[PDB]
Amino acid sequence: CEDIIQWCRRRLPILDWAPHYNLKENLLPDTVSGIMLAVQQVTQGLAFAVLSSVHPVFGLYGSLFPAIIYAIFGMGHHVATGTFALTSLISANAVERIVPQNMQNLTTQSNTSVLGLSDFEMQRIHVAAAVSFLGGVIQVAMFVLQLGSATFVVTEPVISAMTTGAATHVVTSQVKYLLGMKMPYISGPLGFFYIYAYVFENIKSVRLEALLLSLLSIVVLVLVKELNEQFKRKIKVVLPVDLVLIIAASFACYCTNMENTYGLEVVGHIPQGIPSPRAPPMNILSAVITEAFGVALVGYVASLALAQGSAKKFKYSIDDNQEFLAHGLSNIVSSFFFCIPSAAAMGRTAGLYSTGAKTQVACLISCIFVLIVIYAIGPLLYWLPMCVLASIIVVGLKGMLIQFRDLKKYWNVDKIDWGIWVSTYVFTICFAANVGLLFGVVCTIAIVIGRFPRAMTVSIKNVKIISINNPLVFLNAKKFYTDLMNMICYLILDCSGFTFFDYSGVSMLVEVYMDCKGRSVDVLLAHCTASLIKAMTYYGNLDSEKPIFFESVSAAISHIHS
């Protein structure tokens, strides 16, 4: 049928922009954006595969396949799917719990040892792929039963606080690389403070060379990135400072013995790869349920925020339910190619904004470059120090960390969203990002619920006319009663603003009617829609041959003159 064809065409938004592509003004900016995004995605993939307690080579795969799937199935134009450290910090818990460090040695190194990797490295990527697969199927299920229409519960302050707290957590997790020391996997309901306790207790074990390298890299990156923004009118491009820093650090670590003399840590091997696809270990799909739910929700909300921001900024329309399908398909297809959970990072979107990308082609061209890294520039990334990579990551987290300035706006506007922001931030700092999101949503719903029984439900208009403003539900059913008995020969209830109700509202309206009848004051109603009339005539046994319901306030006023 025609409707079936329309439905099928609505699930592939690429056909909306592929034939309409213009190679006269949407090619050069898209190409430049792709080149500038390739290095960002490569560095983020490496640093967030190390953050996910898997081999760094798998973050490179995480920057290739989900981007293609989202380009085919995604609605947002400036959304670049990838590694997204927020989900890596969640999958690391499952990876470290199922496969702890005590099985590091005495391995096989053969018997389906994919790539050139040793054993105990496939045991961890298998758990990560299982987490990705379960998160993808959860997202697809949430697409089937249309929960994308229920995304209004996640408000702006909750997402802002959760992302700021997660940025602080990611900054904390990179501290050991900037300092140069080694720490065990510390996680839990208060790991943020335990990490710094460990750092301060072992302050004599830090390496000065790593500290100076990280400080120099951070200073140079911040200086170049802040000087380029202010001089945008003169310099009409974006300076690739990250690429220059990576090349300089690698060349300085190679034309020395800085891996041996001044004991440093570098990115290990990165073998040339893309092996044959393999199904994830469905045996583990029962022990990673909570991590799968956490990634499937956190990644979706963080990516939907970016998609909605892009749609608002560039004046186009997106669907909150198509993002569910796009992200679920990305995760499911990626889990077969040894990929960690994927989502959209705000830094890549900000880079796309600053470069001038137009369509999803900029997110595809970068993939073409990532392939080149897999097969050609793979072994070349041996001498990049982890201090420089950590400096790059913490400088790129600036957009997420700068969201502390929303506190002034929330204080000057609401002062109730200010408290929600602060509570969500402290919960995200203490426990985690998913706990922070859940707490924020629950707190928002509870606050909005506890504000109906303490708000004015009627308005007196200048026989007296009383207009019913808000809908009459169980939330403000009793408050309505005491609102109407407090404002007491005739009475007109203008029900034009009375849209929807329930059993409690109808029962309370009938109770008000009978109580006013008992106190020798008549109650004439108004528009009252058409279902309200039926409900009130059934509940109150109201006879149809008595004038109670009128078509307008003027009709009731005319009925008074009789």
Nearer to a copy of itself (CB atom), residue 84 or residue 501: 501
Length of the chain: 562
Q: Are strands 458-461 and 465-468 parallel, antiparallel or unpaired?
A: antiparallel
Q: Which stretch binds I ion (CB under 5 A): 3-11, 241-249, 358-366, 427-435?
A: 427-435
Residue of the chain from 49, 433, 509, 523 that contacts I ion (CB under 5 A): 433
> Considering CB distances under 5 to 8 angstroms, the limit depending on partner class, which of I ion, a copy of itself, none binds residue 378?
none
By a kind-dependent CB cut-off of 5 to 8 A, residue 113 interacts, out of a copy of itself, I ion, none, with none
Among the listed residues 166, 298, 420, 468, the single contact to I ion using CB under 5 A: 166
Q: Gaps in the chain (C–N > 2.5 Å) come after which residues?
A: 462, 488
102 binds, among I ion, a copy of itself, none (CB under 5 to 8 A by kind): none
- Cβ atoms within 10 Å of 223's Cβ, excluding its own: 11
In whole angstroms, how close is the CB of 556 to a copy of itself at the nearest point?
16
Q: Which run of H or of E encompasses 2?
A: helix 2-10
Phi and psi angles of residue 323, each rounded to the nearest 5 degrees, phi first:
-65, -35
How is residue 358 written in tokens?
């137009």
CA end-to-end distance (rounded Å), the chain: 61
Name the residue nearer to I ion (CB basis): 78 or 527. 78
The answer to whether 129 and 66 have CB atoms below 8 angstroms apart is no
Partner touching 85 among a copy of itself, I ion, none, CB below 5 to 8 Å by kind: I ion
Question: Looking only at residues 35 through 94 of this chain, which bind I ion when binding is defined by CB under 5 A?
Answer: 85, 89
Interface with a copy of itself (CB under 8 A): 149-150, 152-153, 155-157, 409-410, 412-414, 416-417, 444-445, 448-451, 453, 455-456, 459, 461, 467, 469-471, 473-475, 477-478, 496-500, 502-504, 506-507, 535, 538-539
Please tell me the distance from the alpha carbon of residue 112 to that of residue 203, in angstroms, as a whole number. 43
The answer to whether 288 and 127 are in contact (CB under 8 A) is yes
Contact by Cβ (8 Å): 324, 142: yes
Q: Which one of I ion, a copy of itself, none interacts with residue 444, CB within 5 to 8 A by kind?
A: a copy of itself
* Closest separation in Å from C-beta 43 to I ion: 12
Task: Please state, in angstroms and as integers, the Cα–Cα distance from residue 182 to each residue in 40, 53, 169, 174, following that order.
Answer: 26, 14, 17, 11
Q: How far is CA 318 from CA 73, 75, 153, 306, 352, in A?
A: 12, 6, 18, 11, 18
Q: Closest approach of Cβ 538 to a copy of itself, in Å? A: 5
With tokens 């570098």, the residue in question is: 266
- Residue numbers 344-403 binding I ion by CB under 5 A: 345
- Partner from a copy of itself, I ion, none binding residue 216, C-beta < 5-8 Å depending on class: none
- Of residues 93 and 139, the one with the C-beta less far from I ion: 93
Tell me how far apart the alpha carbons of residues 498 and 509 are, in angstroms, rounded to a whole number: 12
Q: Which partner, I ion, a copy of itself, none, binds residue 10 by CB below 5 to 8 Å per kind? A: none
Nearer to a copy of itself, 122 or 510 (CB): 510
Kindly state the smallest distance separating residue 340's Cβ from I ion, in Å. 13
Interface ranges with I ion (CB under 5 A): 85, 89, 166, 169, 345, 433
